[PDB]
Amino acid sequence: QLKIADIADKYVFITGCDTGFGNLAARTFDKKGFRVIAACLTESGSAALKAKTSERLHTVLLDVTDPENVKKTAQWVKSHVGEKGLWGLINNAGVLGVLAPTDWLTVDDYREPIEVNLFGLINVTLNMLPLVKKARGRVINVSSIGGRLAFGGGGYTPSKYAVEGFNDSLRRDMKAFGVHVSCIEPGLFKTELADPIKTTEKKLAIWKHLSPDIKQQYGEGYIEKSLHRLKSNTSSVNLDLSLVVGCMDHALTSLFPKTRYIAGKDAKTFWIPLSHMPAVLQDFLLLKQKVELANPKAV
Amino acid sequence: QLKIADIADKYVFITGCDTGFGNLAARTFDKKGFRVIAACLTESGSAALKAKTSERLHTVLLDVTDPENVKKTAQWVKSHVGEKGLWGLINNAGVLGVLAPTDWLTVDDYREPIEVNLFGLINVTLNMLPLVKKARGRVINVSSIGGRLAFGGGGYTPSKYAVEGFNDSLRRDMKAFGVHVSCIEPGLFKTELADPIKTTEKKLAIWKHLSPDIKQQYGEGYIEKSLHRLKSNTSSVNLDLSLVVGCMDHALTSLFPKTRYIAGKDAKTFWIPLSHMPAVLQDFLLLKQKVELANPKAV
Numbered sequence: 001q002l003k004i005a006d007i008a009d010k011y012v013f014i015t016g017c018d019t020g021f022g023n024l025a026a027r028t029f030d031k032k033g034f035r036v037i038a039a040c041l042t043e044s045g046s047a048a049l050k051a052k053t054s055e056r057l058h059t060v061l062l063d064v065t066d067p068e069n070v071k072k073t074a075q076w077v078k079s080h081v082g083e084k085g086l087w088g089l090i091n092n093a094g095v096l097g098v099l100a101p102t103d104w105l106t107v108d109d110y111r112e113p114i115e116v117n118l119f120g121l122i123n124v125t126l127n128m129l130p131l132v133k134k135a136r137g138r139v140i141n142v143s144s145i146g147g148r149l150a151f152g153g154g155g156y157t158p159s160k161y162a163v164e165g166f167n168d169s170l171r172r173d174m175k176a177f178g179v180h181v182s183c184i185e186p187g188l189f190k191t192e193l194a195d196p197i198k199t200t201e202k203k204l205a206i207w208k209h210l211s212p213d214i215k216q217q218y219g220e221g222y223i224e225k226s227l228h229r230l231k232s233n234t235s236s237v238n239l240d241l242s243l244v245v246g247c248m249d250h251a252l253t254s255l256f257p258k259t260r261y262i263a264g265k266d267a268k269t270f271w272i273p274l275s276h277m278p279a280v281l282q283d284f285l286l287l288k289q290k291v292e293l294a295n296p297k298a299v
Numbered sequence: 300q301l302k303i304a305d306i307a308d309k310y311v312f313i314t315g316c317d318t319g320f321g322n323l324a325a326r327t328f329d330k331k332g333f334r335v336i337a338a339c340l341t342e343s344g345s346a347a348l349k350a351k352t353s354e355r356l357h358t359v360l361l362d363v364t365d366p367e368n369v370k371k372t373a374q375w376v377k378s379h380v381g382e383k384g385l386w387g388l389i390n391n392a393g394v395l396g397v398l399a400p401t402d403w404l405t406v407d408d409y410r411e412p413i414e415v416n417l418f419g420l421i422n423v424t425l426n427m428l429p430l431v432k433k434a435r436g437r438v439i440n441v442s443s444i445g446g447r448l449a450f451g452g453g454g455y456t457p458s459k460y461a462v463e464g465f466n467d468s469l470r471r472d473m474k475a476f477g478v479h480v481s482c483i484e485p486g487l488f489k490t491e492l493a494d495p496i497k498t499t500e501k502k503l504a505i506w507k508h509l510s511p512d513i514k515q516q517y518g519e520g521y522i523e524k525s526l527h528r529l530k531s532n533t534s535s536v537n538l539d540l541s542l543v544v545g546c547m548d549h550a551l552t553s554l555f556p557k558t559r560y561i562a563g564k565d566a567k568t569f570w571i572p573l574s575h576m577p578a579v580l581q582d583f584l585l586l587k588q589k590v591e592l593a594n595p596k597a598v
């Protein structure tokens with residue numbers, strides 16, 4: 001490790017710092033000596049993070065889906081960092097949206113994850129990019145193993161796939177300016193993103209208004225038996241969020257940041273390898289646990 | 300080839316039949332004996348296709364981004380096909396949108412390709428899916444090599460990446476119902492999608508309102524020198540659209556349709572293989588031709 005020098009003079013802007021990876025990142029980089037600009041969705045998330053950190057850290061309220069708030073925040077960063085520019089941008093904010101079988105969904109159900117995870121990431125990136133160029137800095141995009149292998153119906157999968165493609169377009173565009181772009185692909189980690197109970201609640205809301213034929217095909221208590229698989233293999237969710245923040249740290253401080261980081265033991269040894277395999281192999285493995293439908297010929 | 304039987308009794312719904320792959324598909328499947336429902340964006344595209352085809356083919360006007368038009372069209376198909384259901388759905392409609400360096404763009408520039416290529420594809424699929432299930436039929440999604448390797452800035456890349464992820468979610472959801480889902484990834488083909496002159500026109504529109512610093516970094520006549528690469532290797536664009544329609548034909552008529560079809564000699568032998576490689580190899584190959592910026596240190 002030849003690391004960069006003058007960490008103490010470099011600003012890092014992180015989206016989604018109320019909870020999860022982004023909260024830990026803000027705290028970690030603050031203690032490391034970066035000047036953190038921690039964007040938070042909520043006032044109480046902002047106040048808690050500020051109470052736990054040093055005077056070098058600033059919080060800002062940002063909803064990444066509000067283009068006016070994005071532009072104002074970018075103007076604030078620009079005046080604050082001046083001719084240093086912005087060394088790091090971590091695009092971390094994201095949401096799961098509704099996860100359910102594709103045939104239960106409307107197109108509207110896909111919009112929310114795409115708006116936060118893709119469009120919000122793009123708009124933040126585009127508004128901050130002049131500052132990153134100025135610093136010859138680093139853009140870090142948080143994708144997912146779900147951006148390389150599709151885990152289930154709903155907008156989250158397409159959102160993360162799209163982030164992988166944008167990431168690569170951005171990287172090649174930014175090579176000429178000496179800006180590095182890193183994509184981080186975590187496996188499953190215990191955060192506020194996904195919560196089996198909340199996922200089940202969304203499915204029950206949808207069930208209420210599903211067509212009779214769908215309900216006959218899947219069967220009453222399909223959702224109950226679904227919750228009993230989400231639970232029945234929740235023992236392989238990583239608790240150590242520092243595995244992901246450690247990737248962010250390398251992307252920000254190495255003289256040789258990677259183009260892709262994979263976080264989680266199963267992610268690197270199994271999931272990302274499988275993402276290269278054709279459907280015949282993937283489908284066999286992923287369908288193993290899926291709950292049998294009650295009446296699949298009721299079409 | 301054990302092919303399916305009773306082609307003459309099966310309906311195939313194709314989006315975007317005014318020009319390109321979808322026009323050729325409609326004509327080909329009409330002559331093959333399918334009952335084609337050819338959705339066209341324009342009246343003159345519809346009238347031309349109808350004049351060239353048999354009485355077995357019906358045209359409908361459909362803009363896939365208009366959810367009311369989608370729902371009405373799906374109701375029309377439902378009444379027409381009755382208890383046969385819909386054997387085939389070909390999601391072909393798509394647009395390029397603006398292609399330009401990422402740092403020239405706003406978030407609004409990404410919306411159009413995503414709305415047609417991703418959201419329109421999803422909404423058509425979801426509205427037709429009960430009919431395909433009824434037939435135990437086939438969903439064919441037209442992706443791109445640009446859904447596996449990012450070709451340049453703009454919304455087209457993320458749109459196609461997203462289609463790959465949706466495709467796979469849909470496939471695994473639909474396995475229980477005996478519905479097959481095929482993704483087609485063409486290389487470059489001479490259609491109305493991409494046209495260097497039209498691409499250059501969009502860049503000039505953007506240039507007019509770009510910041511002074513961007514224009515200094517790229518340099519006046521960057522766009523002129525850009526057009527002189529688009530031209531300077533346009534000799535490897537496939538003219539034979541039947542390579543793609545041949546993939547669609549297999550997906551619709553084989554008893555063993557593939558999960559993925561690749562069309563174009565360079566696509567199968569080079570591009571899709573390279574899509575598996577890390578960025579260090581991809582970037583080296585793809586940046587070879589890119590036009591040097593005039594003043595990249597002007598940040």
Ligand SMILES: NC(=O)c1ccc[n+]([C@@H]2O[C@H](COP(=O)([O-])OP(=O)(O)OC[C@H]3O[C@@H](n4cnc5c(N)ncnc54)[C@H](O)[C@@H]3O)[C@@H](O)[C@H]2O)c1
Pocket residue numbers: 015016017018019020021022023040041042045062063064065091092093094095116117120142143144145185186187188189190191192193194
């Ligand atoms: N936890 C996992 O298993 C996992 C796996 C792979 C990828 N990821 C990704 O990690 C990132 C962080 O999520 P997490 O797991 O820490 O979950 P989390 O819900 O704990 O954190 C998400 C953060 O994003 C913020 N946020 C949500 N909507 C926002 C909006 N509109 N504007 C601004 N901020 C917003 C939330 O306030 C929160 O601070 C996301 O991109 C997620 O997709 C998570």
Ligand SMILES: NC(=O)c1ccc[n+]([C@@H]2O[C@H](COP(=O)([O-])OP(=O)(O)OC[C@H]3O[C@@H](n4cnc5c(N)ncnc54)[C@H](O)[C@@H]3O)[C@@H](O)[C@H]2O)c1
Pocket residue numbers: 314315316317318319320321322339340341344361362363364390391392393394415416419441442443444484485486487488489490491492493
């Ligand atoms: N030609 C290529 O090099 C190439 C390569 C890979 C993938 N593709 C894909 O092939 C598909 C077909 O495009 P093409 O190459 O034949 O181009 P094209 O422009 O000739 O055909 C596109 C078709 O989609 C229709 N369409 C456009 N917007 C629509 C909308 N809102 N609603 C309904 N119909 C709409 C157009 O009328 C036309 O019929 C697209 O998904 C494209 O992304 C093309």
